[PDB]
Amino acid sequence: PGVCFKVLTTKEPKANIKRCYNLPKTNNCLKCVLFVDASNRMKCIDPNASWLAERLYRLKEKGVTCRGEA
Fold it and tell me: In Å, how far from its chain's centre is CA 53?
Protein backbone atom coordinates (compact mmCIF):
# COMPACT_ATOMS: atom_id res chain seq x y z
CA PRO A 1 0.00 0.00 0.00
CA GLY A 2 2.87 2.49 0.41
CA VAL A 3 3.49 2.22 -3.33
CA CYS A 4 2.87 4.23 -6.52
CA PHE A 5 2.47 2.77 -10.01
CA LYS A 6 2.88 4.83 -13.19
CA VAL A 7 2.78 1.91 -15.66
CA LEU A 8 0.31 -0.97 -15.40
CA THR A 9 0.39 -4.75 -15.77
CA THR A 10 -2.01 -6.01 -18.44
CA LYS A 11 -0.81 -9.57 -19.06
CA GLU A 12 -2.39 -12.11 -16.73
CA PRO A 13 0.13 -13.44 -14.22
CA LYS A 14 0.44 -17.23 -13.80
CA ALA A 15 1.79 -16.92 -10.25
CA ASN A 16 -0.43 -17.65 -7.28
CA ILE A 17 -1.63 -14.40 -5.72
CA LYS A 18 -1.67 -14.30 -1.93
CA ARG A 19 -2.88 -10.72 -1.26
CA CYS A 20 -4.43 -7.93 -3.22
CA TYR A 21 -5.27 -4.27 -2.68
CA ASN A 22 -7.18 -1.70 -4.67
CA LEU A 23 -4.89 1.33 -5.07
CA PRO A 24 -6.42 4.75 -5.73
CA LYS A 25 -5.73 7.17 -8.57
CA THR A 26 -3.79 10.21 -7.36
CA ASN A 27 -2.01 13.07 -9.13
CA ASN A 28 1.13 10.96 -9.65
CA CYS A 29 -0.18 7.38 -9.35
CA LEU A 30 -2.60 5.25 -11.38
CA LYS A 31 -5.66 3.38 -10.09
CA CYS A 32 -4.81 -0.31 -10.18
CA VAL A 33 -5.34 -3.61 -8.48
CA LEU A 34 -2.17 -4.55 -6.66
CA PHE A 35 -1.43 -8.30 -6.74
CA VAL A 36 1.21 -9.64 -4.32
CA ASP A 37 2.36 -13.11 -5.36
CA ALA A 38 3.72 -16.00 -3.31
CA SER A 39 7.26 -14.72 -4.08
CA ASN A 40 6.26 -11.33 -2.64
CA ARG A 41 6.53 -9.77 -6.12
CA MET A 42 4.11 -6.95 -6.92
CA LYS A 43 2.21 -6.32 -10.16
CA CYS A 44 -0.41 -3.60 -10.32
CA ILE A 45 -3.11 -4.62 -12.75
CA ASP A 46 -4.95 -2.26 -15.12
CA PRO A 47 -8.59 -2.24 -13.81
CA ASN A 48 -9.69 -2.46 -17.42
CA ALA A 49 -7.84 -5.75 -18.07
CA SER A 50 -10.31 -8.14 -19.72
CA TRP A 51 -9.36 -11.13 -17.58
CA LEU A 52 -9.35 -9.32 -14.24
CA ALA A 53 -12.99 -9.87 -13.16
CA GLU A 54 -12.70 -13.62 -13.69
CA ARG A 55 -9.29 -13.72 -11.91
CA LEU A 56 -10.82 -11.90 -8.91
CA TYR A 57 -13.69 -14.44 -8.88
CA ARG A 58 -11.13 -17.25 -8.88
CA LEU A 59 -9.10 -15.62 -6.11
CA LYS A 60 -12.18 -15.35 -3.95
CA GLU A 61 -12.89 -19.03 -4.52
CA LYS A 62 -9.34 -19.57 -3.17
CA GLY A 63 -9.94 -17.48 -0.03
CA VAL A 64 -8.42 -14.17 -1.25
CA THR A 65 -10.39 -10.90 -1.42
CA CYS A 66 -8.81 -7.56 -2.24
CA ARG A 67 -8.71 -4.89 0.44
CA GLY A 68 -9.52 -1.22 -0.27
CA GLU A 69 -12.38 0.12 -2.42
CA ALA A 70 -13.16 -0.94 -6.06
Answer: 11
Q: How far apart are CA 19 and CA 67, in angstroms?
A: 8
CA separation for the pair 16, 37 (Å, rounded): 6
Contact 6, 23 (CB under 8 A): no
- Residue 29 sits in a domain of what CATH number? 2.40.50.40
Does residue 5 contact residue 32 with C-beta atoms inside 8 Å?
Answer: yes
Domain count for the chain: 1
Q: Please give the resolution of this entry in Å, rounded to 1 decimal.
A: 1.6
Cβ-based neighbour number of residue 25 at 10 Å? 11
